[PDB]
Amino acid sequence: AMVDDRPSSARLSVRALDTTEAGNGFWEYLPPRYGAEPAPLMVFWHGIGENGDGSEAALDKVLANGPPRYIERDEWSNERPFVVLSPQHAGGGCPSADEIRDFLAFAVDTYEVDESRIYLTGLSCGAIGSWNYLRAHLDTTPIAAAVLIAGNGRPAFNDHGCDLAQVPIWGFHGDADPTVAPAGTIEPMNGLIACAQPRADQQLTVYEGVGHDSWSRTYSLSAGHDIYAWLLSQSR
């Protein structure tokens, strides 16, 4: 097949709140081969600093960190096969479990995606929300794996224990984080890793001496943890 090979920003589109069926404004990134075969899906949730009302103007905030930052800057490899959606959370705190559920339902209904390869990822509030999403919806979640950075999964693991270990998770945290305590990732990932086989893959990365921003070095691969290859190795 012949394939679009323009840099990633060429396929980045703003989808403001109330221009789609979604309950969030979001950034839409389509991979080069979108449409040719069902694509893996990645839904990324931003941190609290980037909250906004989902309008086009407000959505610019979401470009600050994570996948949409690299996509907008043409620093997101064309080899990456994901549809990447980056919704904006409105209001004052972290996205809720049901907000994340509803947006994942929208995404799967709307895009030509491989439903066996739905990936959830977030940083800070976006990770906190994703953990809470798993706590609420573990028994029905369609996701294949999650990469959760600088969040708090203690309630989710306290609730479910090794039942949660059926979802593959890679948790990341800086151990000097003064904003979200690193026990938030370390305790649940240690618990999940200790869970007996058969269980999903579980990984924990602790950046020693690193503060709250443990996401830049993760999503950019400057720290050498290939979260994209790991996600793609997971499926339902």
Task: Give the residue, chosen from 15, 117, 160, 217, that forms a contact with Cl ion under the rule CB under 5 A.
Answer: 217
Can you count the helices (H) and strands (E) in the chain? 8, 8
Q: Which stretch binds Cl ion (CB under 5 A): 44-52, 125-133, 149-157, 214-222?
A: 214-222
What's the min distance (Å) between Cβ of 219 and Cl ion?
12
Task: Give the residue, chosen from 90, 195, 223, 232, that forms a contact with Cl ion under the rule CB under 5 A.
Answer: 223
What's the min distance (Å) between Cβ of 223 and Cl ion?
4
215 φ, ψ (degrees, to nearest 5):
-85, -35
Subset of residues 71 to 100 that bind Cl ion, contact rule: CB under 5 A: 91-92
Q: Which is nearer to Cl ion, 92 or 198 (CB)?
A: 92
24 φ, ψ (degrees, to nearest 5):
-135, 140
Q: Give yes or no for residue 49 binding Cl ion (CB under 5 A).
A: no
Residues 72, 7: Cα–Cα separation, whole Å = 9
Query: Minimal CA–CA distance to 224: which of 172, 159, 150?
Result: 172
What's the min distance (Å) between Cβ of 228 and Cl ion?
17
What's the min distance (Å) between Cβ of 214 and Cl ion?
10
| Vertex 35: Cα angle to 45 and 167 (nearest 5) | 40
Residue carrying the six token digits 């221009």 = 19
